[PDB]
C-alpha cells in the first residue's frame, strides 16, 4: 500500500523526501512492490517468467510466433528513461525531485516530491525549484543511528560520531 514511517522495508531501507516516503533497495536488488526488494534476473526466459527484472518490472511471456520473453513494467507503469514509472508520471519533469502518486482522489494523479531543501514551486510548473524545509519523520530506533540528509534524501545513518554491520 502506502509507505509510512512504520513500513518495514524488506531487504531495503526507508528514505524521506519532501512529499513522501519510499523504500530504497540494498545492494543491486530491485523493487517487486513498494516495500519488498529481491534479486534481479539478468535474462528473461521461460525459467524467469514472473521473477523481478527491475523496479516494478518482471519477466513476462509475449504472444506471437515465435513467443518471446522480455522485462515489462507492472500494471500501472511504463518504461521512461530505462525505469518503470507510474503512468501518471509519463510526461512529468520535477527537477531536483521525483514524481509520485497522489491517491487521495478517485482519479489518481502525479505530483512532485523533492530533495531535502526544496518544495514544489507553483511559479515553475510545480517543479522542485522552490526553497523549503522538510522535517525528518524517520524513527531511527537503532541506539547508534539518527536521521541524516544524505545525497538530498533523509535516511537513517550513523550518528555524527560513528561510522559503519552496526554503526560504530
Amino acid at each position, epitope marked *: 500500500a502506502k509507505v509510512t514511517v512504520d513500513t518495514v522495508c524488506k531487504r531495503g531501507f526507508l528514505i524521506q523526501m519532501s512529499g513522501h516516503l519510499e523504500c530504497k533497495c540494498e545492494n543491486d536488488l530491485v523493487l517487486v512492490n513498494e516495500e519488498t526488494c529481491e534479486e534481479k534476473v539478468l535474462k528473461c526466459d521461460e525459467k524467469t517468467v514472473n521473477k523481478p527484472c527491475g523496479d516494478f518490472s518482471k519477466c513476462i511471456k509475449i504472444d506471437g510466433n515465435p513467443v518471446s520473453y522480455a522485462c515489462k513494467c507492472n500494471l500501472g507503469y*511504463d518504461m521512461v528513461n530505462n525505469v518503470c514509472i507510474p*503512468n*501518471e*508520471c*509519463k*510526461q*512529468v519533469t520535477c527537477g531536483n525531485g521525483k*514524481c509520485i502518486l497522489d491517491t*487521495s*482522489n*478517485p*482519479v*489518481k*494523479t*502525479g*505530483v512532485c516530491s523533492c530533495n531535502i531543501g526544496k518544495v514544489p514551486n*507553483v*511559479q515553475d*510548473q*510545480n517543479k522542485c525549484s522552490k526553497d523549503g524545509e522538510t522535517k525528518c519523520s524517520l524513527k531511527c530506533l537503532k541506539e547508534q543511528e539518527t536521521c541524516k540528509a544524505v545525497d538530498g534524501i533523509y535516511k537513517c545513518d550513523c550518528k555524527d560520531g560513528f561510522i559503519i554491520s552496526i554503526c560504530t
Partner: antibody, heavy 119, light 108 residues
Framework: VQLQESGPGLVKPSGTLSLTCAVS?????????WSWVRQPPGKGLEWVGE???????HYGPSLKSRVSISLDKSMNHFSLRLSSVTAADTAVYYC?????????????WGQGTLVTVSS | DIQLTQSPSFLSASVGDRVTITCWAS??????LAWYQQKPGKTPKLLIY???TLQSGVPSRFSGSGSGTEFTLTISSLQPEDFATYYC?????????FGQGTTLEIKR
C-alpha cells in the same frame, strides 16, 4: 505533437457519427489517457469520453450506450463513434491529450471538426 | 456527479483592469481545478491547472486561487487579446465536467 480530427461533417438523424483523431509530431503513447470533447453551437464544453492506452473507457453519462471510443496504437490515432444521433449531437468535436500531473486536464487539443445532424 | 458553475456568465472590463472569474464545484475537489481560454470557434487553450499553477507559455498576468468548492481565475492587467470565453474543468472523479463558461468582452 499535433492533434487532428477528421470524419464526415453531415450525419442523417438516427445515423452514426464517426470521427478519428490522428496524432502526429509525436506518439500517441506520450500520454496514457486521451479524450473527446464536444461543443454544441453557442453552448459550452462537454466531455464526451476517454480511453487509455490499455483500452479502459469512460463516457459521459448523458450519452448512455450510444458512445464508444477505440484506440489504434499502431496507427497513432484514436476514434469516436456515436450512434442514434439527433440534432442535439450537432457540435464541434475536439480530441485532447490528457495530462494527470496535479489533477487531470487536457494540455493538447485538436483543430476541432463540426458534425451537423440533419437530413 | 460534480457540477461546475461559473460567475458571472458575461463580463466587460477595460484594458489594464483586473478581472476575477469564479468557479463553484458542487463538492470538494481539493485544488484539482483547471482553466481554459477559448476564442470563438477556436481550440481551447490550457491556462492554469491545480487551481493556481500557471501552464508554460501563459503570461504572468493570469493567476488562479482557491481550494475545495470555490476557485478564482484572475487577470491582473487586461490586454486586448484577452477577450475569450473561459471554462473551468475538473476530473477528480468521473465523469469529467466543465463550467458553463464566462465570456469576457474588452471594454473600450
Amino acid at each position: 505533437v499535433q492533434l487532428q480530427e477528421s470524419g464526415p461533417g453531415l450525419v442523417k438523424p438516427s445515423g452514426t457519427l464517426s470521427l478519428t483523431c490522428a496524432v502526429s509530431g509525436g506518439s500517441i503513447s506520450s500520454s496514457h489517457w486521451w479524450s473527446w470533447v464536444r461543443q454544441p453551437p453557442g453552448k459550452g464544453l462537454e466531455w464526451v469520453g476517454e480511453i487509455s492506452l490499455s483500452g479502459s473507457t469512460h463516457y459521459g453519462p448523458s450519452l448512455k450506450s450510444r458512445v464508444s471510443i477505440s484506440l489504434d496504437k499502431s496507427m497513432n490515432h484514436f476514434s469516436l463513434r456515436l450512434s442514434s444521433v439527433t440534432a442535439a449531437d450537432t457540435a464541434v468535436y475536439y480530441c485532447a491529450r490528457e495530462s494527470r500531473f496535479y489533477g487531470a486536464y487536457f494540455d493538447y487539443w485538436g483543430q476541432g471538426t463540426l458534425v451537423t445532424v440533419s437530413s | 456527479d460534480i457540477q461546475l458553475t461559473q460567475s458571472p456568465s458575461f463580463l466587460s472590463a477595460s484594458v489594464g483592469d483586473r478581472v476575477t472569474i469564479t468557479c463553484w464545484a458542487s463538492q470538494g475537489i481539493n485544488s484539482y481545478l483547471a482553466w481554459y481560454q477559448q476564442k470563438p470557434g477556436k481550440t481551447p487553450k490550457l491556462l492554469i491547472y491545480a487551481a493556481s499553477t500557471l501552464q508554460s507559455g501563459v503570461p504572468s498576468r493570469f493567476s488562479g486561487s482557491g481550494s475545495g468548492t470555490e476557485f478564482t481565475l484572475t487577470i491582473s492587467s487586461l490586454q486586448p487579446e484577452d477577450f475569450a470565453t473561459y471554462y473551468c474543468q475538473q476530473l477528480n472523479s468521473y465523469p469529467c465536467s466543465f463550467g458553463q463558461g464566462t465570456t469576457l468582452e474588452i471594454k473600450r
